[PDB]
Amino acid sequence: NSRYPTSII
Amino acid sequence: GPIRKVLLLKEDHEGLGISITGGKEHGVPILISEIHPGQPADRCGGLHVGDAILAVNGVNLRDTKHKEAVTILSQQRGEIEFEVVYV
């Protein structure tokens, strides 16, 4: 997992 | 690094072609964590993994929460100007 949330956009 | 202005051209059936992470609630800028091959950000040539997105089309993203940034970024259409910096 990424250190913090990730969004694909 | 130096602050850069970068132009991206997106068609209406496409997304930006990036993954972003971070946000104000995490005390981290909106950061590009992925540039997806062949999609608009890759094609524009000037956006890279590790870039912080400071603004898009004049909208400051320095103090935006993660989901605020997603909404703002996904709203943009056509010829889209980014202000970015690699730290």
Q: How far A4 CA lies from chain B's nearest CA (Å)?
A: 6
* Best to test chain A binding among B16, B19, B77 (most A CBs inside 10 Å): B19
CATH number at residue B63: 2.30.42.10
Resolution value (Å, 1 decimal):
1.1
- Residue B40 and residue B15: Cα distance in Å, rounded? 7
Per the structure, the complete domain to which residue B6 belongs is given by 1-87
Number of domains in chain B: 1
- Residue B26 and residue B11: Cα distance in Å, rounded? 32
Structure tokens at B13: 């059936």
- Residue B1 and residue A7: Cα distance in Å, rounded? 25
H helix and E strand count, chain B? 2, 6
- Angle (CA) B63 B27 B5, round 5°: 45
- Residue B11 and residue B30: Cα distance in Å, rounded? 23
Identify the experimental approach: X-ray
Structure tokens at A7: 């969004």
B13 contacts: CB under 8 Å, gap ≥ 6: none
- Residue B61 and residue B63: Cα distance in Å, rounded? 6
Nearest CA to B87 among B32, B43, B6, B5? B32
